Symmetry: D2
Amino acid sequence: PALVQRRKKVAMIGSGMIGGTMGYLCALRELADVVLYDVVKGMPEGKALDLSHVTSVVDTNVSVRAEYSYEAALTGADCVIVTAGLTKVPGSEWSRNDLLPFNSKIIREIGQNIKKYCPKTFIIVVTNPLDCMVKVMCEASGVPTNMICGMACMLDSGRFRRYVADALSVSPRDVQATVIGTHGDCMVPLVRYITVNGYPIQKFIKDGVVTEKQLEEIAEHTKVSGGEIVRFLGQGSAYYAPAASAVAMATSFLNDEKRVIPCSVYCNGEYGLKDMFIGLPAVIGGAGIERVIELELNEEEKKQFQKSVDDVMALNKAVAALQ
Amino acid sequence: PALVQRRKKVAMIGSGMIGGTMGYLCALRELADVVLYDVVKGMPEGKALDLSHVTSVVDTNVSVRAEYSYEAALTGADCVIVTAGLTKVPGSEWSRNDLLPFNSKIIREIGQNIKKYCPKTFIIVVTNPLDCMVKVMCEASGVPTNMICGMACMLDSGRFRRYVADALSVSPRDVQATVIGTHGDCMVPLVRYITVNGYPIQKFIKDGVVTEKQLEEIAEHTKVSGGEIVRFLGQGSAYYAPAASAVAMATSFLNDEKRVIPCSVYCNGEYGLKDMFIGLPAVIGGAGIERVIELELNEEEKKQFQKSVDDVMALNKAVAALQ
Amino acid sequence: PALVQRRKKVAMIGSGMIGGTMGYLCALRELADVVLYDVVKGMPEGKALDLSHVTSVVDTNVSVRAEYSYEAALTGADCVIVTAGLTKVPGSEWSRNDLLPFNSKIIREIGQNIKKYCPKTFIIVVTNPLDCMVKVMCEASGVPTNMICGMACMLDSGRFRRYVADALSVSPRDVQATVIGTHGDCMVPLVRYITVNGYPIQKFIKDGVVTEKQLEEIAEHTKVSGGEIVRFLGQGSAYYAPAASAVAMATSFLNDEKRVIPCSVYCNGEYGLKDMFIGLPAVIGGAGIERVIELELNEEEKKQFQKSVDDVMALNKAVAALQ
Amino acid sequence: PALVQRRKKVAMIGSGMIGGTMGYLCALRELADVVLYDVVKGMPEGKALDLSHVTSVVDTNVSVRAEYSYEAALTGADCVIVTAGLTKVPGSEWSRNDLLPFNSKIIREIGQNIKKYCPKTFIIVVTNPLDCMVKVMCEASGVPTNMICGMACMLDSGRFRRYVADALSVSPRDVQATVIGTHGDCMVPLVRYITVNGYPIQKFIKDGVVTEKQLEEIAEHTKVSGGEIVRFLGQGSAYYAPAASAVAMATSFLNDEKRVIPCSVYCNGEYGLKDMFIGLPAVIGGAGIERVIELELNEEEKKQFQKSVDDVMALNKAVAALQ
């Protein structure tokens, strides 16, 4: 008979370290069939076999396949997570003359193919410079603005929460700490908003549990966390947490969870921003980005966010100026 | 050879609806071997068999057994969760003359047996009136004050969060809402402290997402939630959420998670309270209650908490006045 | 915008102990939105509230609601699990004159309503006498024969596996033991087919690990397991394992897992049976029952299975003879 | 107060692709604190930070740290998983003159340090040539023979099961297929023993579902699966399934699950083998390897297993001949 319930399908456009790790999460949790795509022949097929073997070991059943053409990787994809492209320099210069032309071109082409093969998909961009690339993707793919976002701020917020959790000796599940803005030295970790299960951090400072300076050192540590890992790895960059972040976003969409996750989202009025994507707290459900949350920022926070804004507007102009 | 790694063991003293449901969570998650104890012969053995069968179905392996003597139920228990005793009236009168003598007596006896067979266990009391019974248990068992707590506020907070989550259309994972105090009409849901992933509820009110009155209706709904279920059930009371709550507390202890969970804890100075247990936010880790969090309460909050306090002090006097 | 990914929806027609426990599994695993239906007003609403509270506690987000009309419980249901009806006598007489008329009538009515509101659903019947009721349901609902089955044999097989697992000291995950036939003293636990991770039990007997007599005692224990629990409970029957069993079946369908699970399935040729449902090993995927596995039974096994067959044919005649 | 329940601790001696992936499984499942050790400074620290960030993202709390000295990596380790050493050639020559001296030396040193710092640990060796290295480790560490094993056959069996599962269209959870012997072209996939939830494959052949030749092609595919991935990757080898395999073994030990998993185990009599480790089905529980299962092998199977044996004995002689 006919297939009444089909498995969800997630297409990883890019099968380097983050793409393969995201495929691993899918196989481990039986979240969805996975297609690993890449322009470089070889890696995708070896990773897809290894991943198919994982299903046996952990007793799950999803199909993991490698595909090298857009039509086969994209067709039927409920969600597409893009990591394709050159990797940026930790924390402008070479990026404007080498990163930007190359990545804006490839993201645009991926979007044109999403428009062609899976116009109803939920797109999650990872490729940098993030906020800039999410706009290029939105324009090329033509999908509703609530159906595309970029993964970055959940990763930066996860780092922020891990450091605070160590300082307070609590599980990070119970630390709510958020970073908004764009992924670079420009990001804004909101120290003032930190809560421990909804209890403001100010009281923990008054009680001598942690000091203001300590929180600012944590905020600075969060900003340079990406580069710190790049330097230790020697080659490549972080992938375990970036993969878990993108997959948590994809899962909230696929299961209409309505999780609240900071991510690069489309603004039309919030924070006074128009027609642009930038990192902000959003609700992700079965209708994609269902709400962009507007926080009451104080003077200093507005000043740092403004910096993130100027930075995204400048890169977008540079992208337009290439056409 | 010798057993180097043994499974954790959780003893459910009381095998009515909550005790059996907690045993189910253990079997489903392969959390620990389970012993179902009760004074009424029959139910514990039927539930233990049903539960042993669950392990096959869900592919886990823990031992679920019924025991009717203290020595066999308690010996080797890493955690003991007590639901034994009469059930209170939803939201003083009959409780002072019937509930209190009966339950203070049985809790005291259970504690004397914990002192005898598993003095190093982590005790979680569920039996009502909660805060009062936790003190009786602490005195009878003689365990360190950080190794005993009572489950109630996590359940009340879970109700509170579910209602707010529906009002805001977000996953309750991302609603931090807390109830402190004692389990009755005296409980204090902290509406002012509500946060959505650490973002204060006040802004959501300003943005027209929810109104103040609506939040107060939710707070009132939270207070009468237990009785509402009792009335719909016709017989007995809630058990799915109370079981999940107690087990989440036990899991944070067994795995030293350091989760932040409101629960009845020992105070010596916090909020100005001494030698008593009352519902407050606490950190639960491998050393039991590792921190009791002191919130900055405003005038109105102090007034309602005070009410919870007076109520717990009055019941404790009534318990002492029985010896 | 429009909802692109909606949550699966499972309708529990019957909200007694098994229906509510199945709703609990759904809330705990974030498997699907749940509707608890029943003719008795009260229980469904109290259980649905308790279950909604569980989602907060375990950090998941699914909607659990009570419904008392067919149109609201059934509409949009991807899977319908029916436990409605009188409960049989452990392990013919009163069943023919009281159980059969009452349950054949209610199952027929539920099917007519499934035909009306959710003709594309996957139906899992639990109501006894199982195999008989599954045929009544198939005829009333009119759904394709691969889209209806009955839960029983997975429960009986789970019991069988738990006992063998204890005898061998291995996890039941690694015991493959199956019961085929109809749910009663007529069931057929296939002792000869028992395997430990695919290794035949005969060698374990040769090695002195377990004896033939011991396996037959386990087979007999499996046959009377339902009644044993009924006697210990005093009131009602097993529900934790029966719920986990039905939900495992529903999950294999909803996620197109293609698990191999013994369950009451439609035969047209297998084992020489035609137009009837009986307990056999089947593959459950996104197209429902995708394969009914035909085992090579020996002389003695055919004889005991035949007994199950005669029993199902006799009850079906008795059901037809009521119209 | 004192820590009563401490988290389990798993030391990954080797932090290349498999070691870091195993650390990821630990963080994702909150299985245990993790220490990533390696001789190469840099990678371990970057991977440990990335992994610590994962805990925030997936809401778990375990500590992931990098360590470069034996005393700090090993002390307190409940389980030690070793991947340190040169990687072999897919499917003798250079291995005898370069791989063997180098790896036998490093494994011996790791064992001497395990004897010194964590003599009660459960050792899982991954480093090749596997069976040979497990004996070197057993001799150097001095731990009871039931407390050391090698991971290989579960990976080979997982590959075998995935291929059969695709051929039959069932979840690999329900395919029991085993490979015994040593990890190389010498491995023995037991085609005759294949079962689908305990139902022999011979009937599926009779029913035309799969053919004998097809099963032999799958057996051959299983033997060359490691090399196939190496060739597609271009650099390095498989790691997702090898990590999941080792961690499944470690989990069965840490939680005394008593899973049945083929792995390199100590023989003293089984299959007529003495004082050697070779890949066989074993039960892994809280007392380590609790049973080595002896299968009734036919003429052809004994012949192929013998080949695995001769191969392991030859490498062991070559290892002794180096001292």
